[PDB]
Amino acid sequence: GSFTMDFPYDLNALFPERISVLDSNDPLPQVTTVIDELGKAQANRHHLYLLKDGEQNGGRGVIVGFLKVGYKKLFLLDQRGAHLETEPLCVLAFYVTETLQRHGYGSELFDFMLKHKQVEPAQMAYDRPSPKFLSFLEKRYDLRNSVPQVNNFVVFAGFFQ
Amino acid sequence: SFTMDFPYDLNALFPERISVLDSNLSAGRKAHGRPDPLPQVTTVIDELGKNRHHLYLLKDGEGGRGVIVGFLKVGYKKLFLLDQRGAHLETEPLCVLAFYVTETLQRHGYGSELFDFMLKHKQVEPAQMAYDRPSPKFLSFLEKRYDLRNSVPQVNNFVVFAGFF
Ligand SMILES: CC(=O)SCCNC(=O)CCNC(=O)[C@H](O)C(C)(C)COP(=O)(O)OP(=O)(O)OC[C@H]1O[C@@H](n2cnc3c(N)ncnc32)[C@H](O)[C@@H]1OP(=O)(O)O
Numbered sequence: 001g002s003f004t005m006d007f008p009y010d011l012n013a014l015f016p017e018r019i020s021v022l023d024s025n026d027p028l029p030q031v032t033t034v035i036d037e038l039g040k041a042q043a044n045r046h047h048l049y050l051l052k053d054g055e056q057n058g059g060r061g062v063i064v065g066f067l068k069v070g071y072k073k074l075f076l077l078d079q080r081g082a083h084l085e086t087e088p089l090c091v092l093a094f095y096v097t098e099t100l101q102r103h104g105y106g107s108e109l110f111d112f113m114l115k116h117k118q119v120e121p122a123q124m125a126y127d128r129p130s131p132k133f134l135s136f137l138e139k140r141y142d143l144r145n146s147v148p149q150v151n152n153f154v155v156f157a158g159f160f161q
Numbered sequence: 162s163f164t165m166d167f168p169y170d171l172n173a174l175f176p177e178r179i180s181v182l183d184s185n186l187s188a189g190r191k192a193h194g195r196p197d198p199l200p201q202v203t204t205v206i207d208e209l210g211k212n213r214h215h216l217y218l219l220k221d222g223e224g225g226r227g228v229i230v231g232f233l234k235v236g237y238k239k240l241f242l243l244d245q246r247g248a249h250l251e252t253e254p255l256c257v258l259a260f261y262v263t264e265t266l267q268r269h270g271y272g273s274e275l276f277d278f279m280l281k282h283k284q285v286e287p288a289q290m291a292y293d294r295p296s297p298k299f300l301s302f303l304e305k306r307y308d309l310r311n312s313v314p315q316v317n318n319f320v321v322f323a324g325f326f
């Protein structure tokens with residue numbers, strides 16, 4: 001249980017963000033309890049996935065990572081450098097808490113999104129991805145061959161077709 | 162209300178800022194024996210919806226589970242705007258991106274309570290922000306409650322008023 005709210009049906013359907021918390025199958029970092037604040041110190045909605053793992057505090061546990069995807073209208077270059085407008089699903093944010101990286105949490109988060117969006121990794125665009133995320137994509141999803149862009153998004157060979 | 166523990170680095174990098182605040186006029190009304198009627202609701206457990214943007218949720222409170230009666234989402238956006246004489250102008254104001262109060266409770270002052278809370282806490286006036294594709298009811302809201310009447314025509318789907326400049 002991650003939320004304690006009741007939503008009217010209309011508000012829920014028009015809710016500007018889609019959010020999912022899933023449980024996971026180690027050094028615990030320091031945490032803060034969030035109560036009423038997160039992040040503090042015909043519409044195509046982005047989908048935020050959060051991963052929980054642990055039984056701290058009678059099962060409450062800890063959110064160890066998040067993944068945000070979404071549709072974005074992108075003007076891309078193709079294989080022959082021709083221009084092409086398109087609206088793929090994009091990874092917009094991807095993070096696992098530092099001390100728990102390289103423990104498989106990211107893979108779990110990413111896999112859940114694929115299964116449920118029924119998209120493959122080569123069919124998405126990646127917004128300004130970090131070195132670690134590139135490595136992750138190259139090593140765990142065999143995404144090796146990129147088609148050069150000038151708009152800060154990365155897309156791989158399979159995307160075209 | 163949330164029941165999660167966030168690591169500090171994850172919290173600081175969290176891609177969205179979200180705030181839930183309790184309603185005063187909802188509390189006052191219930192307290193004086195004339196609470197507003199709640200529609201049928203769904204209990205959320207692990208699913209919602211089935212420069213960071215800031216999402217505000219207004220809770221009608223119980224002391225059990227309250228009810229979210231409205232939401233307001235703002236965020237900074239880089240915009241290429243036209244001014245009053247049509248000169249081009251790039252600027253990055255706070256924008257309203259989404260604004261909704263559940264249907265049966267519209268026109269009870271709830272939208273005003275959310276909008277006022279955002280203005281105080283973001284410390285902006287309504288004329289200094291831009292409005293992304295606002296619905297007719299929201300325009301009405303702006304015109305009637307905040308005296309935002311004079312629009313400066315744009316071609317990019319955002320609405321801004323004279324005071325903005
Ligand atoms: C487009 C944007 O959203 S950019 C994403 C934001 N990320 C950052 O700023 C820094 C790193 N942050 C992270 O959250 C993670 O490292 C992620 C999200 C990229 C991957 O999630 P993890 O839980 O770490 O991935 P998981 O453990 O499932 O798989 C591990 C693989 O990811 C990569 N990886 C994870 N940590 C590192 C690291 N420190 N250096 C290099 N590669 C790394 C490697 O491919 C690794 O495989 P290896 O152990 O065989 O070298």
Ligand SMILES: CC(=O)SCCNC(=O)CCNC(=O)[C@H](O)C(C)(C)COP(=O)(O)OP(=O)(O)OC[C@H]1O[C@@H](n2cnc3c(N)ncnc32)[C@H](O)[C@@H]1OP(=O)(O)O
Pocket residue numbers: 257258259260261262263266267268269270271272273274292293294295296297298299301302303305306
């Ligand atoms: C940028 C984007 O997000 S566009 C906004 C999305 N809106 C919609 O899809 C439809 C309407 N949805 C709503 O959620 C609301 O009516 C809001 C958010 C626009 C205003 O919230 P409320 O809680 O209803 O506002 P509040 O009760 O404080 O003030 C009422 C004023 O809003 C306006 N308003 C509210 N409902 C209506 C309506 N059916 N018709 C016309 N104006 C309305 C009027 O100006 C009204 O003043 P009046 O009663 O003197 O005419």
Ligand SMILES: [K+]
Pocket residue numbers: 036162183
């Ligand atoms: K509360």
